[PDB]
Amino acid sequence: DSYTHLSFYEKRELFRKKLREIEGPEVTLVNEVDDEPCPSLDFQFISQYRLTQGVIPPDPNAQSGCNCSSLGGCDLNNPSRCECLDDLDEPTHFAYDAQGRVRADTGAVIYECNSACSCSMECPNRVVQRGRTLPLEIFKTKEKGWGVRSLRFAPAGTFITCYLGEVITSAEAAKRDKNDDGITYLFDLDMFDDASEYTVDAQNYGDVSRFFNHSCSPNIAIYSAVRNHGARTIYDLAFFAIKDIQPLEELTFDYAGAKDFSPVQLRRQCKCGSANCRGWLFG
Ligand SMILES: Nc1ncnc2c1ncn2[C@@H]1O[C@H](CSCC[C@H](N)C(=O)O)[C@@H](O)[C@H]1O
Ligand SMILES: [Mg+2]
Ligand SMILES: [Zn+2]
Ligand SMILES: [Zn+2]
Ligand SMILES: [Zn+2]
Ligand SMILES: [Zn+2]
């Protein structure tokens, strides 16, 4: 809707109310830049993928887990016991260190524990699952529309959040004609399969990561975090810090290979401002 019957204050207060109702750590809104009161009030905040028509989810009959049974669950210092890690090359280790941060030597694929595993929810191998721990702020950037930044220092390897949205088909992707601003592009789930062609559209439903902007010099990156032992047509898109992040520093990831820069079928350039900037065109 245009929401013309709602005033600057009413609209902004409604977006704030909407943020307050998110579970886990606080999310704030700020626009010290222009008088855009808030992002779309239609947008919904979800804690897991919102599946759609024709999207076959992983079969819980193909689920397997582990036998590690001790205090705190699975033992960082003994990864060769944990069946959840068998698909890794030697030397097997968990993706996470004693600090609960992704290791510098961890590859693109994180293998987390699942409902099938005997370990409790406090397992070191359920970091993504336990979700965001940092307070975040949706703020108005100078040239790139809305953006997100942390209120707290974040060491490299710190888990931030997952990219959520409607999971949709190629057929559905074509049916949605996307152009205007606050238009997200699609995030292919192509890390493993190609037949699936499942994609994540955060226009109407998503996470705070829906407001993360592109940088050619990013401070966060996507780790494909797999739990379910079926076919991997659907898996978690997990943001971790790849650089130490100052308070109030804009969270940016490299969209290339992940989030599209144009609608599936005039243009606006990259404003990340990095010296290495590739001048990537949007739309
Ligand atoms: N480096 C960059 N330069 C210019 N526009 C950018 C950008 N990174 C992201 N964007 C914009 O952000 C969109 C993705 S959705 C991210 C949040 C968006 N800024 C909003 O206001 O809701 C892109 O389609 C593009 O329009
Ligand atoms: Mg890709
Ligand atoms: Zn475990
Ligand atoms: Zn285990
Ligand atoms: Zn396990
Ligand atoms: Zn750039």
Residue numbers in the entry: 195 to 373, 376 to 461, 473 to 490
Task: Give the published text.
Clr4 is the sole H3K9me2/3 methyltransferase in the fission yeast Schizosaccharomyces pombe, and recent evidence suggests that ubiquitination of lysine 14 on histone H3 (H3K14ub) plays a key role in H3K9 methylation. The SUV39 enzymatic activity facilitates the transfer of a methyl group from S-adenosyl-L-methionine (SAM) to the ε-amino group of lysine 9 on histone H3 with high specificity, thereby converting the cofactor to S-adenosyl-L-homocysteine (SAH). Our structure-function approach shows that the H3K14ub substrate binds specifically and tightly to the catalytic domain of Clr4, and thereby stimulates the enzyme by over 250-fold. We combined biochemical and structural methods to decipher the molecular mechanism governing the stimulation of Clr4 by H3K14ub. These experiments identified a ubiquitin binding region (UBR) in the catalytic domain of Clr4, which mediates H3K14ub binding, and mutations that disrupt this interaction interface lose heterochromatin function.
